[PDB]
Design a protein around this ligand. Structure first.
Ligand SMILES: CCOC(=O)CC[C@H](C[C@@H]1CCNC1=O)NC(=O)[C@H](CC=C(C)C)CC(=O)[C@@H](NC(=O)[C@H](CO)NC(=O)OC(C)(C)C)C(C)C
Ligand SMILES: CCOC(=O)CC[C@H](C[C@@H]1CCNC1=O)NC(=O)[C@H](CC=C(C)C)CC(=O)[C@@H](NC(=O)[C@H](CO)NC(=O)OC(C)(C)C)C(C)C
Lengths: 301, 301
């Protein structure tokens, strides 16, 4: 009956974390086989932060401009290139700890685990969601850049995020492992701000299914709703519109619990309009939107 | 400005997880050097669950009564004993992945990370606190017994918890690595229930210090309080009484923020009496009690 935000076990990723230094700038990098990936802004310095030309800044560097440390062991850079907002450093050794892996670009609403690292040393792990506004409500201090986000399924590590910056509101922005930014953000210290965010409707619904599979039915009601009537309440409470694709995704959870999706949507509409009055769902006093339908299945095994 | 419940990176512990089978009962064990630790109730069967004599049940077993798997690799049991509610299985190989480690018995209020495991395979990690009532609000499905809780400080793993049971309310009970139970619980399927729980005052206060170190001061006030006057509001709202030791522990955070402890206690008393009215502290709509003063320092590095 207990229900937590669970992170994937971080071992396979810990073994890939390294420190990358260029001048007086140190940050984290990801060491897979004989390549080290890291934010290209390692190459920036004090002044050229508001307006960096990365092409110009990189042509002035050599393979020994980059110092790369796995543990206290040093690795030799034997070649380098820039791919979008990432550096790709070729090194003399293949990481003997390289897991089976892939690079994936996740979509908003999807969740992943972040291994927060400082100077190439893993310090903490937590579960995150890609917000509709392409930021993450993470926890990153000075020296956290190059920390990665990932999912794991049977020993295959899907990398999906690398950390680059904190925005003024305190939220975090970064790239896939290609690394193209998620969202309209750039790796220069300018006036960029997160757009307005929305609650992830599909996840709230998934999580209400989890509450029922877990035994609790108090919020359910005798009513139903149409998609369009739901989306009017959604629009007022700043929830993403529900689509037919979302309704289909909720199929398996709907069948398992015997509660129709639009009936669950009626239940949610009632929770939105009437509040929760002193009560909790799966331990929470708020409607949780950072568990996907896939997360619900796995944790309600 | 973002603030998450962070778990320790789980790698060092993943490498120690194994599967232990005895009859038709499989669960997890912890493999350190040439010893495998696991809940003694691996040796129980269908009927003898409500009333097991573990001494009687164990004398009837031999070293080959126990099947132990690290990965798919098998390990040979070459001796065995029972220590309190744990089995200690001696095996032919020392775990080549044994981290530097210790066994610690934690106190209520303290926090730790749990690596939830199924059949010797790590599946998720999350941060937990030992509740005042000696249970944990964890997340454990069938097959999770033998999962461990731990802290890590510079590559030393302090093991503090091993999972044994779920209580009727959905909360979890287990032992230290000696393994004496935390709380008045026993490893037999009887009528045991968690006692009434309390909010961990020291942690709420620590977390209010974190909110200020993180920039937010809205809940602060011009008032102060005495320890005794605070403990009267505490008693009504089911918070642990504050002691002088707790006031001393909050010393460093008090000095760093320039807010006196009893002034913070005045702020908390005001939050308890007036609610939070639509506002949030470090992202939360509730007063968080699962971050210790030590947790606050580390995550506000
Ligand atoms: C040790 C040196 O190497 C690193 O690891 C850097 C890690 C931190 C990530 C930070 C640390 C705190 N939270 C984070 O996520 N990233 C950065 O500082 C980024 C590096 C970007 C470059 C060099 C072009 C820049 C930022 O995150 C900075 N953020 C901004 O400039 C944001 C977005 O552009 N803008 C912003 O805050 O608005 C102003 C400029 C009007 C005040 C903050 C530190 C103020
Ligand atoms: C695969 C077989 O091996 C395992 O891994 C066992 C792991 C689970 C842990 C469970 C699973 C769900 N949540 C958990 O934490 N532990 C157990 O089932 C425990 C094994 C104890 C023995 C054999 C003496 C027993 C329990 O946790 C059981 N709990 C109780 O009996 C609790 C506390 O005594 N009592 C209780 O619920 O009240 C009743 C008896 C009046 C209904 C539940 C499964 C019902």
């Amino acid at each position: 009956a207990g229900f937590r935000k669970m992170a994937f076990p971080s071992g396979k990723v810990e073994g890939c974390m390294v420190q990358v230094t260029c001048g007086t700038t140190t940050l984290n990098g990801l060491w897979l086989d004989d390549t080290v990936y890291c934010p290209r802004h390692v190459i920036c310095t004090a002044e050229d932060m508001l307006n960096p030309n990365y092409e110009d800044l990189l042509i002035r560097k050599s393979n020994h401009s980059f110092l790369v440390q796995a543990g206290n062991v040093q690795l030799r850079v034997i070649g380098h290139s820039m791919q979008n907002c990432l550096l790709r450093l070729k090194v003399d050794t293949s990481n003997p700890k390289t897991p089976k892996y892939k690079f994936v670009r996740i979509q908003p609403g999807q969740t992943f685990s972040v291994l927060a690292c400082y100077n190439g040393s893993p310090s903490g792990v937590y579960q995150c969601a890609m917000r509709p506004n392409h930021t993450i409500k993470g926890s990153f201090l000075n020296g956290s850049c190059g920390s990665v986000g990932f999912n794991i399924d049977y020993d295959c590590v899907s990398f999906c995020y690398m950390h680059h910056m904190e925005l003024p509101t305190g939220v975090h922005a970064g790239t896939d492992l290609e690394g193209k930014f998620y969202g309209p953000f750039v790796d220069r210290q300018t006036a960029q701000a997160a757009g307005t965010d929305t609650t992830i409707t599909l996840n709230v619904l998934a999580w209400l299914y989890a509450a029922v599979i877990n035994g609790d039915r108090w919020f359910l009601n005798r009513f139903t709703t149409t998609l369009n009537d739901f989306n009017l309440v959604a629009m007022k409470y700043n929830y993403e519109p529900l689509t037919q694709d979302h309704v289909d995704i909720l199929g398996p959870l709907s069948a398992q619990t015997g509660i129709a999706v639009l009936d669950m949507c009626a239940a949610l509409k009632e929770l939105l309009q009437n509040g929760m009055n002193g009560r909790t769902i799966l331990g929470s006093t708020i409607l949780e939107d950072e568990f996907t339908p896939f997360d619900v299945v796995r944790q309600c095994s």
